[model samples]
Target: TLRAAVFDLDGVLALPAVFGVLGRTEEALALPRGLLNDAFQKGGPEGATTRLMKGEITLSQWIPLMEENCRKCSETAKVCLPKNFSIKEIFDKAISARKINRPMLQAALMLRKKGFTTAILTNTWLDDRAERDGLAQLMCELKMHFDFLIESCQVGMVKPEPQIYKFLLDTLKASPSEVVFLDDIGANLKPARDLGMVTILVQDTDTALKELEKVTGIQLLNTPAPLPTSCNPSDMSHGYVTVKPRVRLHFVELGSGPAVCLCHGFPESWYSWRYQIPALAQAGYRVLAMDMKGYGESSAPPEIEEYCMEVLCKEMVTFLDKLGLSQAVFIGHDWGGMLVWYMALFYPERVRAVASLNTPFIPANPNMSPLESIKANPVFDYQLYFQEPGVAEAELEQNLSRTFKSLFRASDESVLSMHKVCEAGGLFVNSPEEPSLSRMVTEEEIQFYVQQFKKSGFRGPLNWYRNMERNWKWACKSLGRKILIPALMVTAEKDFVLVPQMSQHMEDWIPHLKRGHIEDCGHWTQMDKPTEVNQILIKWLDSDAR
Candidate 1:
């Protein structure tokens, strides 16, 4: 059984805040539903992003477009503000209008303590700065317990769309079976439910929990009734664990455990590992696919400092403590694979064995910047783009459909070919809009991502890039600590982002490393090649390498 849960904000977690905004504006301004929906549905400011990229649009143009979108939606549009109203002032008012559901917020915290992977997915406007800030504040004040927050504005897509759903699924790496989507709107619930996820409509907490129990067969609330447990075996064929703290961090476990823990990497989530879940569970391991804190159904702390390796490794330790586990195996891929290395160093005894795909542990060497190395070796220029403020978010959000296509570039050779040339540096060339490539992401997937990422305008994830200095300082101080536990490192040969050289020094960094370099795979090694990955993981898990 999978150990993960998702919650919807608004009506279900808190009172319906969107209703408050729409109702108040309608009552106060006497605007018709047609006008409001029409305004809400329109694409954001014309050429706002394009002009900004070309230096044709200034902050002045962008700010006003933001103000106009809100004014057009609210009842107080023309009558309340002057034509010259500063964008900041309009933003301030809109934020004041949106409310939050404190009750649901509290419930989420309680759920996390019970060892459930929880997240928040909301559909809201991105153009309005004030309203966005208000929701962000709500997340922080609530103690940042949610694993993921999806907002529509940032993704440039809306709900009930498949691309958005896929975006959430892809980012969270969550399998359709493992996910439990909760949304107040039946329209939103329909698509998610159709995608193989058990869904709950936010009505009352009790009803929500009961329905979830029926669909997921997992208890969500703190009820007196005992939680049900199904006998299942974990395949462990394609998974491994990394122990960072004294606690054993088990990334892959099946059957009869107090709980299951999972982890994910950047631009990916538990859904990416979908095929393996059932196979593993049938073999008797309790299934869990984690949405690493900032990625999918996980928390994204507000501060740049919070994104540092030191802080994140600590979080893993604390998370295990919070779950009341003495030790569990740690499994990771991509960024997660990198994390397993640090986690093992920080808490070696807690990890049973480490398994990684397409990533290897390399301690901080006298190297200048890993980013610089990544940029130079592959000649990929996006790493430099990541350093800039809002560039990556803008590039992706400017045209969600377009960016989504870029992520799942078709044809491994084509993708590798581009990196071969572009990695040479200079400004990363923007490929012409390929409406055809846009098909790579479904409508629901894009809408889901737009809703989740628009919150706080990528400030949370971008902070991860800003903390390289901090990560270096901490990693250097803690250097020379090797992972003594049995370790598995698998690299995808066709993965352009992390080339083979990325893992070239694993033997030096990890004392007992068992490496596997898989052929005919891309960055998404597990999902792209599940059978091969599973077989490798199973053999390692059953072996007495320790």
Candidate 2:
């Protein structure tokens, strides 16, 4: 929706040709006989320029005086302190300091040619008016490419001010929604973003331009021209789509009647539910298999707060709003199972029915302390470690390949043998964390898991654990609100991480509850016993509970 692009002038558009001459001075100073070395050993051309720019000392007060002092000091004091300094020579060298950044300049020119209103803004001191004018003239020589140029000295406002952004919007006769601003410094873009203009931190002009085109639906320069049959959403199958703040959310939809959004657990993408997707679709009930945020193709926000359960739940409801679906059945496994339980408590209206596989929503016990809670479920001792600052991500990154292999290895007689005895707390071990060396998933499956985890580590998934207390408080508020919708809790009998007893309170928590137990399965019940899982899920979906 953005029609215009703005830029920050100095570093992005052109470098002062003098920066190269400054480099020469730095190189000369590094030598034993250089004028700078004879004075301050560390005081090189680069350091002086940096000091001058930072206002540590004014260029007018320091540069001229330093030059004369350097000349005199080279003979008398052997270190420049003061008295004799020259300004004229330094001014000459600085005047020759202007050069253009070709790629960025070309990109901006091309954007302007294509009818995008382009503008520039910069922070400059009034004392540097001559230098600023020189830079302005260079821009003019480059065809005066920008439609408008803003100088901080004239406006009396620097970047990171909302007024400067407002000034540009008003002057251009454009609303905040109509503009996009690109700057090398992220701080400069904040105020513009706060004003509602789309912003991009420019690293490479070509790449930034391409992203702009993708977001604004305007083609950039130097790309293959759009064909008459260019791809669009209408070219794809029917599904739900929602545009979040930073990314587009897409859902693959199948089926016809009542809806059920099937959220997958960690270490698995939506593809893990491939077996159930078609079954639900064939049964005349619409099914949605989603790639939860940070797992697959969902948006990944850098902040940890964005991954909190509150945020994720809000995103789910927002997704529903975008779909125009008032409420629907919610089903999950593992982390997805955790999500469904939390969803019921947070947004019950958006959840028509609920089903959890293997995992169960166990309310926090009033009498149980945190230490006691972990002692009761030693398997969850690992979760306590995950709740630490950076252990999960570090461990996963260190052993990603091996971890994937452990997760994806196929189930066989030996694994089934282990699964049979896993119930007595011996299978996966209740002591130190179990080593994943016993059974391994396939290489391709391992690679897939690795790829997904690498995109965004366990931070978002781990955040679920961090919200335990918060979730408990929310659930307590809904204590009288029984699960009015039909619900199913599928338990894998031989599962270790989540045992059969974990689902014991389902009948009390959910008013209408149906339970199914699958034999000869491990923690990955859905994949290990696909036939049984599918059959149970189908029966539940086809029941009159709809």
Candidate 3:
């Protein structure tokens, strides 16, 4: 076990307030970045910043030199420097800009909790401006979290200096091998590594923490993030919880009994289960209508691989763990139907039974990936378009209400064509995408859906389509595995995308499978025929226990 975890202050524990401000200031003034910084570096050993770090000059005195360097660089380049730009003003903003890397602080706190000593060593400056601006007091409060804080300004020595290494080891009362040093600068890390101490040059704090975890047998991350309290998560009851390490899913939970997890498909939210939520809750069951990962209130991580089916299955199991549930009767629609089937396959113990609306349990084609098979056909070009990062979002998010108008339609109405969506490089590129008159959604409901898409664009929703190959590969693990759970398949007669014929062979894989068809309904089964969908669900569940 490591005896001590030593950290460099500026880039490790906290960020310097000046650089971010200077970078932005440079951009606004039409001056190139690093010019003033280069000018500071060009100065000799007795430079303003070097002397300031050695406590030979104050911050107020250094600001004059900093201002002169900025002016000098601009003059040499023949660029007109903005007269209103002031180094003093920049520093004033910097006082608040000095953000503490709270996660790293939490990491240090965890180390302390695990009986590991934590210390900070920094090459600082004698800044009277800091004293007057309360930045010094802020640092004093920060110092309490660590065992020791060594300031070069106070010690008259800086990092990468041989003598300081001796001082650090002596102060910590630990051998070089026993101490793990974390610094942002390679120069600062080299000496520690040479001295037989474990060193990490932190470029990214999250990656740094993971490295620290590797060195020290402590869990620095991967814990579920706490729900954001200030989002007014009350009106429709959007309670939040974490899924994957970087994912936080939002759900509206109702009632109290046996858990019934409802997962909605693409471009849909808990509203997809709005009818089912109250129905299931009223019938002595716990209703959990989640926005699914990457939907409303849930985090939309930009990686396509993160949206794979297995990840969602594992996350659903983890979600169950967080909710104090051993198992749940998982019900899903469309893309969510894909996830629920995977859950039953991968984590069968956590799923008491599984049900899908409008989606069939698609076994992986062992010969070719689903994407390759789809890519071979031009009709599957809808998913091909969504594979691009910003393409789908730009088209769909451009007009949220119009998107809602186009998608929420029955078969009797002018329905959205998957093949036609990507013909002209957009949803309505070649085809005339007309608005829908489906009574499934009211104007109020349309606007509510509009508000949701406005917040969490189409990027995350489209990501599901992007991972067709990955989903196929993940499902390849349980290729021949049978779903022994009590499974039900509800098909919509008029669902243009997922027709009733799709459920023809699902009974081959699911032994205890029951099929229900809602006639005269489109893809939006529950919304199209709430009474029929509800009766099928309540009756099937009421008949027997899994």
Candidate 4:
């Protein structure tokens, strides 16, 4: 029986943020790709990395040495390189970019719950004061995950050294035979194997988990829990449709009747329509909820231009066409709601009727871009942080559960007042100290959202914000055109960002618009008040106005 599990921290439990630094270094110094890696590898036993890992040198001393080695490598290769490269700057960026692997953390938790002791064995430098503080912060964040954290710098015995492995075995009070060790580096695994411990080389998450499963007979990977309530996973089918050339959208469909397409907003998936799907289906309408391009199990192109309103509208039209539907009623929330408004504005024929929750229709401005409009009003200043690539993604991806909880939360007057802080410092600032599960969402639902985010990452979703101006440019053509289709807008009274007042002039743009308001709800209107939302939706769909 397995008594303990040992894991390497870097590259096994957390990815090296230094890859971005290396990329930026290559551009700045005009050095060839892999120059730093080559320098570190070729430096032999006395290399900067080797000495630092062995606690022989501090990071401050090692930084210049590493840069000098890189410069020599570049010169030998006849490549022009900067004489003095700022290693500290790039190293800081790498440190900042470092993120814990959530699945691996969960797997470790599973192992511990199964009565297996868990430990982390890492070879890292802690010479600098700031570096030590940073490590302290990282340890605090991940302290509970492991029973023991053995660092070479603290123990004075680096990995690939027999003593480090011996120390780990002694500290955990387990024999080599009872312990299983995992490390990304083959050298690190070699010593563990020689000590009679089971060793798994972690090339990727899936392969590592499978190897562990075979050895321990414990499933290390978790399958996402099925949607709660009447929405059966069997009834809900997932598939991809080629909505555009080389752009396939992943969508979930349920029931059969007049098509009622559901679209979700930022950081949301088709799962956002969980309550509505079964409700609408029971009302005798076919429901289709899509993982709108970058948000869910959908195509997320890297190009910021790919997410513009014009391109997104085309994708929606193509999605309907690919499903062989001549026309369908559309329901959207948040960014999805914003898209549906444009869907009616640009592709009127494809949309039979449109309904939006919490998102108001903003007529295209001839003078200002979306970002400019946002900057003009400080209340929406958080969008400015999102406009930059890699800025919000890094922060959000750093803590997936925290980011999700902070965004997908209930709002009252108390919470609305606190939103002003977000406008000043941007979202993710002063987020709840713990996971604040909204009353509307369950723990399982939050986990599902977290799982999707872990798979997709935040870059694709953040790209939507990067395309604000481009969306505005494309939306200019429909400046004078009113959304002639019958429309419905549901306003959440407690929504901080998209206040009900935002929808006041929407009737001027949408001539046949009908509106409803849900009290004591936040940005997440549907999830916050599912019954009310469903009732309003069904009644409106069945109304003669349609």
**What C-alpha lDDT do the candidate models reach, one value each?**
0.59, 0.64, 0.79, 0.78
The true-versus-predicted C-alpha distance at residue 402 of model 3, in Å, is 0.2
Kindly state the number of residue pairs that clash in model 2.
Answer: 13
RMSD of each: 24.1, 25.3, 24.2, 22.2
lDDT of 3 by residue, 146-252 (tens): 88998888988877788888999999999999999999878878989999999888878999998999999789887544211111224446677886577888888
**2 or 3, which is superior by TM-score?**
3
- Most accurate candidate by TM-score: 4
Candidate 2 per-residue lDDT, tens place, 96-135, comes to: 5655776566666667767888888765433443455554
CA lDDT of 184 in candidate 1? 79
Sorted on TM-score, highest at the top, how do the candidates line up? 4, 3, 2, 1
- Find the 10 residues in a row with the least total lDDT in model 3: 224-233
Clashes of 4: 0
After superposing candidate 2 on the true structure, give the runs of residues whose Cα lies further than 4 Å from its correct spot: 1-244, 247-250, 366-372, 409-442
lDDT for 137 (candidate 4): 55
State which candidate, 1 or 3, has the greater TM-score.
3
lDDT of 4 at 102: 69
Ranking of candidates on lDDT, top first: 3, 4, 2, 1
Question: What's each prediction's TM-score?
Answer: 0.49, 0.50, 0.56, 0.56
Q: What are the runs in model 3 whose C-alpha is more than 4 Å off? A: 1-236, 375-379, 430-437
Q: lDDT score of model 4?
A: 0.78
